[PDB]
Amino acid sequence: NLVQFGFMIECAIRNRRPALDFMNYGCYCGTVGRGTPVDDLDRCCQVHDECYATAEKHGCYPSLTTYQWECRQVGNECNSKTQCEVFVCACDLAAAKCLAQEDYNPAHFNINTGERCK
């Protein structure tokens, strides 16, 4: 579910930033969900939305599915059981690893989405 996604982000970035910093970034990270991503970090969110769109086609409800995962010494891992749980955990794990690796440009926090996201 989305709270676990938050936890994944904190795990991946070793609590460097609150998960909330990734909920107002660019055109896709917690903002409008359309336009050209402003950078590769924003594109992580666009990809995560596409992964959830697939999960919905599979008959899952990704924002609501509660999965099993682990925050390890060296990274995170999914260890989930149902088909939906496996898939949604995978979508969240890929997005959290993506967000943790891409460059976080502070000028891309809280952007003008009216102007930049058409």
Tokens of 30: 């917690």
Catalytic residue positions, numbered: 48, 92
Residue 100 CA to residue 36 CA, distance in Å, equals: 20
User: Which is nearest to 25 in space by CA: 9, 14, 8?
Assistant: 9
Token pair 């999914």: residue: 78
Tokens of 81: 């059981």
E-strand spans in 5-87?
Answer: 69-71, 76-78
The SS3 of residue 43 is helix
Residue 67 CA to residue 78 CA, distance in Å, equals: 8
